[PDB]
Design a protein around this ligand. Structure first.
Ligand code: HEM
Ligand code: HEM
Ligand SMILES: C/C=C(C)/C=C/C=C/C(OC)[C@@H](C)[C@H](OC)[C@@H](C)CCc1oc2c(O)c(OC)cc(OC)c2c(=O)c1C
Ligand code: FES
Lengths: 74, 107, 127, 196, 330, 123, 49
């Protein structure tokens, strides 16, 4: 079958709250790839990443999937 | 007193290909040979020390080899601000002496 | 980051003393390594003139050794060249530079001044 | 400290052994052993676990004996003093993949896979952490994160950069009891086994 | 006790020895409970003026027992030889390197070599076995000084007008808290045996790697914080030791004319400032050396010392005078 | 007396090797790091040493990885100064391994060592 | 141990030569394969069997 965690994650990525969170992560990811294609990136000592926005996404998903996943497992 | 002979003297090349300058000294220096880069604007920079060691900021396309009395300075591509006068000094004994100079022009 | 800024007379008359000051910011003269003067002739032959160390020890090219005196002022963080009784010989652009010394790799001049062009001319300027 | 350097807080899963009155699930322990044998044991030793402790927990006396005898251990020298080997017995400890530390680093880009005998107690988060680590490899790192060559990203590991790749994939194991071997199921099982 | 065998020999107690995990978990959790109860015993003494004359000797012997108990638990912690053991032994033996001229000599003598090694762990086990018996002899000296003046009481005044025998009344009253103590210790030992320890000490000690997650045992955290607040090596270790010795000063800086805080409004308030300041010191100890925390720890350190040296003498003087002018009519 | 093969260490990487029970730190330093090390003023250092006082060859930083406060092993590529951080009481070292902040009074000690071509011999 | 001979019956140099005539197990190389080593003064006099 399909993995039960992957299932519940996909399900929750597509709630209102999950969509808002992937939006903010996506808006970050866009901002970053633009910065990489503008000269002097390998010499900036100020490179932005999107770990924070990623962590907010993952945290929301964890909070929703964790109480439910094991009722689907044996 | 040692003296270095920078050959070729002021030879030119194209818009992105390799080139090999050299420095020969009268006496035997160890590997104590530095390479400097004087820009057209009079701005002078360090490029190589101990005839292989890159200084901070100087790009990967610069080499530097040799030993004893024969030395080298090789480039990958000349894109585009490699146009300058290149020198070379020894420092195994006082006084330090430089080469004759080697201008790099673009046709 | 270290900065070397040069100032002084860009025109002296023969038989006089040439005086150049090299101002260092971002690092003390007394802290570290070797502080050098060199000159570039129009015939494109670089000549090493001399240094003063962080201790205050002098070391000059024997070619010019009897004329020049390289001094420093710790308070203002600058060292000086003084080339005495100049000729049209001494027409060059002068550079001050720091050299490091590691016991394996030896010396290497890593921080350079802007370059001050001096002309030994009989003309009149405006001081 | 930054969230990346701390690592992502592992959430609380509903383990069946959580709670004052709750035993381990011994079927999950049995399965977890298989996942250990078929996946993890290729890089991870289990030095502190003797074969005999499996008996009556996850396997029968007979099953464990067969499993131990599949391995050779050093025996006492013969009458003449030459070395000789021996099939394993129940008194023996589960053998590891590597002969020494240097050989283990060579096979893993210079990294050392820890022994797993205590790993559940030797980490904050316990079962929650181990499980979350194993099921928490993203297909791609978050934007801007420059991963060292040979490293992998995992948000639950402190600093994000871990030297173990994802190794659990769906149906890479054929569970002897029929259970669908999804990655989260296999993670749930080894982790239960490693807690034991 | 061999450095090669110590960690595995404790795993052997955990796995192979019948009821071995019970013995180990009783010992480890009991050490923690020993400190919880000692802090309460000390805090009781602080509140009720038990350190006062004629019980100064009683108090001073108590401070010695406390130092010995702290040293004993450190020696035991090293015997596990987990990661926290090795670096605990390293950091704490190095405390003595701060001693002028002959400090590094003391340390190499304590180690028995170039670093914390087999000599070190074998002698720390031998010493861990010894010091509990010296603590037992000091407890007898503690009870001897207790016996000549008897216990104080919550009113802070004489007990001579109404005594009742220890037997029956306080034997059975002791029994009530003995069982409550055992109940709670049992809940940890059986249901939550590792909650008061550190996960890194389930990793064998490694001389080449200090974990980023290193944290002292919880009962040592307030003192750790005090040391960490001083950005100087020597003064860091001096100030930390002084944080223990300053307990000796209280009979002299308590200027009050009545024993204990029961009828003292300002003293009660500042006592609880002290207690919660002490808890903060411990919460700072558990934190990273980072912006808000470094300053908070330095201020809490000041408050800790200021309590004994400044607050108590000033406040007890004020309360003396307040008691007087509130009743005298001239 | 430990032999370390320097030809085996990549460009910007730390290697830790045992010598007399102590950890020996070896970094193959980048050109940018070498400049960072030798461009620091003594006035900013509680234990004033030039990078050249501390290394024989600017490419190879070789030191005892023993924090000079209370003996913990500093963590590589961490801290506020581009070098090592000591987790025990928060000492920061720079890319020459000098003490820049925290209770440690001294720079990371340099052991005796000589080179033999592709390998250094510590001891 | 070889070192105890020094200053008793032999010189530092003599004992070093004697110890180096014997091979002892060394630490495994970078790849984990076993390897041997000449003896040093810290070693114990080896037996025939
Ligand atoms: C099999 C499902 C499996 C388990 C279980 C597992 C677990 C595991 C843990 C808990 C760690 C420790 C992580 C930590 O420090 O918090 C760990 C580390 C490593 N592993 Fe692993 N591992 C499993 C499987 C495998 C396999 C098959 C390999 C070898 C290809 C492997 C390797 C490693 C390595 C290497 C590490 C070190 C991580 C690091 O130091 O960055 N594991 N594993
Ligand atoms: C192993 C440690 C110790 C033991 C077994 C011990 C035991 C006792 C006993 C039996 C009493 C009488 C009952 C009581 O008041 O609780 C007592 C009183 C007292 N102890 Fe301790 N003690 C210990 C440590 C300490 C410490 C660490 C201090 C202080 C630093 C201390 C200070 C006192 C004081 C001042 C009293 C008198 C209290 C009063 O009557 O008001 N003791 N102790
Ligand atoms: C033979 C006996 C010997 C040599 C020693 C006995 C005497 C010493 C003590 O008091 C008696 C001593 C324990 C001290 O008392 C001031 C305690 C408050 C110690 C406080 C303490 O703990 C730490 C600790 O536990 C650690 O673990 C991982 C790590 C630590 O660094 C990170 C520390 C630490 O930095 C301090 C100050
Ligand atoms: S031991 Fe490194 S900071 Fe205290």
């Amino acid at each position: 079958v399909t993995d039960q965690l992957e299932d519940l994650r996909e399900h929750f990525k597509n709630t209102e709250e999950g969509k808002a969170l992937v939006h903010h992560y996506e808006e970050c990811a866009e901002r970053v790839k633009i910065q990489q294609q503008q000269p002097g990136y390998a010499d900036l000592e100020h490179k932005e990443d999107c770990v924070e926005e990623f962590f907010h996404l993952q945290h929301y998903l964890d909070t929703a999937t964790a109480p439910r996943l094991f009722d689907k497992l044996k | 007193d040692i003296e270095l002979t920078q050959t070729p003297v002021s030879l030119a090349a194209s818009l992105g290909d390799r080139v090999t300058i050299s420095c020969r000294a009268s006496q035997d220096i160890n590997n104590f040979l530095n390479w400097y880069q004087q820009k057209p604007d009079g701005t002078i920079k360090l490029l190589i020390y101990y005839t292989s060691r890159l200084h901070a900021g100087v790009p990967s396309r610069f080499s530097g080899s040799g030993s004893g009395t024969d030395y080298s300075l090789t480039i990958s591509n000349l894109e585009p601000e490699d146009i300058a006068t290149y020198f070379c000094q020894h420092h195994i004994k006082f006084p330090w002496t430089f080469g004759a100079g080697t201008k790099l022009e673009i046709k | 980051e270290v900065k070397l800024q040069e100032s002084g007379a860009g025109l002296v008359q023969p038989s006089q003393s040439l005086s150049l000051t090299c101002s260092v910011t971002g690092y003390s003269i007394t802290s570290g390594y070797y502080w050098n003067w060199i000159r570039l002739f129009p015939g494109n032959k670089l000549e090493w003139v001399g240094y003063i160390s962080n201790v205050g020890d002098n070391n000059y090219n024997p070619s010019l050794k009897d004329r020049l005196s390289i001094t420093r002022d710790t308070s203002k963080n600058q060292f000086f060249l003084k080339l005495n009784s100049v000729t049209t010989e001494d027409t060059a652009t002068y550079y001050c530079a720091r050299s490091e010394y590691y016991s394996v790799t030896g010396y290497a001049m890593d921080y350079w001044g802007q370059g001050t062009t001096v002309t030994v001319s009989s003309a009149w300027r405006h001081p | 400290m930054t969230a990346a350097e701390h690592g992502l807080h592992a959430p609380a899963y509903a383990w069946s052994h959580n709670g004052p009155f709750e035993t381990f699930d011994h079927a999950s322990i049995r399965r977890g052993y298989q996942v250990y044998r078929e996946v993890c044991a290729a890089c991870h030793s289990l030095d502190r676990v003797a074969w005999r402790t499996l008996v009556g927990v996850s396997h029968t006396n007979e099953e464990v004996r067969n499993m131990a005898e599949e391995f050779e251990y050093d025996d006492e020298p013969d009458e003449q003093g030459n070395p000789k080997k021996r099939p394993g017995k129940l008194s023996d400890y589960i053998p590891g993949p590597y002969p020494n530390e240097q050989a283990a680093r060579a096979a893993n880009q210079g990294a050392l896979p820890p022994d797993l005998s205590l790993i559940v107690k030797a980490r904050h988060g316990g079962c929650d952490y181990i499980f979350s680590l194993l099921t928490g490899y993203p297909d791609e790192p978050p934007a801007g994160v420059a991963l060292p060559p040979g490293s992998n990203y995992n948000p639950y590991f402190p600093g994000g950069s871990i030297a173990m790749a994802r190794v659990l994939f769906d149906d890479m194991v054929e569970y002897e009891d029929g259970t669908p071997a999804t990655t989260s199921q296999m993670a749930k099982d080894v982790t239960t086994f490693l807690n034991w | 006790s061999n450095i090669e065998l110590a960690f595995s020999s404790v795993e052997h107690i955990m796995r192979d020895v019948h009821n071995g995990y019970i013995l180990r978990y009783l010992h480890a959790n009991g050490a923690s409970f020993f400190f919880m109860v000692m802090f309460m015993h000390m805090a009781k003494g602080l509140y009720y003026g038990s350190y006062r004359s004629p019980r100064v000797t009683l108090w001073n012997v108590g401070v010695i027992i406390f130092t010995l108990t702290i040293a004993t638990a450190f020696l035991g912690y090293c015997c596990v030889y987990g990661q926290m053991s090795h670096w605990g032994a390293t950091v704490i033996t190095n405390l003595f390197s701060a001693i002028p001229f002959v400090g590094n000599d003391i340390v190499s003598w304590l180690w028995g070599g170039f670093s914390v090694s087999n000599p070190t762990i074998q002698r720390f086990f031998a010493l861990h076995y010894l010091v509990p018996f010296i603590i037992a002899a000091m407890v007898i000296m503690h009870l001897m000084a207790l016996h000549i003046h008897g216990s104080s009481n919550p009113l802070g005044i004489t007990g001579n007008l109404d005594r009742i025998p220890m037997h029956s009344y306080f034997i059975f009253k002791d029994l009530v808290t003995v069982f409550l103590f055992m109940l709670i210790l049992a809940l940890f030992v059986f249901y939550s045996p590792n909650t008061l320890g550190h996960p890194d000490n389930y990793i064998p000690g490694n001389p080449l790697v200090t974990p980023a997650s290193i944290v002292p045992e919880w009962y040592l955290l307030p003192f750790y914080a005090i040391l960490r607040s001083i950005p100087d090596k020597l003064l860091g270790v001096i100030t930390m030791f002084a944080a223990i010795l300053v307990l000796l000063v209280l009979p002299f800086t308590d200027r009050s004319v009545v024993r204990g805080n029961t009828f003292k409004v300002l003293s009660k308030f500042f006592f609880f400032i002290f207690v919660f300041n002490f808890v903060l010191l411990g919460q700072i100890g558990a934190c990273h050396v980072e912006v808000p925390y470094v300053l908070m720890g330095q201020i809490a350190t000041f408050i800790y010392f200021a309590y004994f040296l400044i607050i108590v003498p000033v406040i007890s003087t004020i309360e003396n005078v307040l008691f007087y002018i509130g009743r005298v009519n001239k | 007396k430990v032999e370390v093969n320097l030809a085996a260490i990549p460009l910007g990487k730390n290697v830790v090797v045992k010598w007399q029970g102590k950890p020996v730190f070896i970094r193959h330093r980048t050109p940018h790091e070498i400049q960072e090390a030798n461009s620091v003023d003594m006035s900013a250092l509680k234990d004033p040493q030039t990078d050249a006082d501390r290394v024989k060859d600017p490419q190879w930083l070789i030191m005892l990885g023993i924090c000079t406060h209370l003996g913990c092993v500093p963590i590589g590529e961490a801290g506020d100064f581009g070098g090592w951080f000591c987790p025990c009481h928060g000492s920061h070292y720079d890319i020459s391994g000098r003490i820049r902040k925290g209770p440690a009074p001294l720079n990371l000690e340099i052991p005796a060592y000589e080179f033999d071509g592709d390998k250094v011999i510590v001891g």
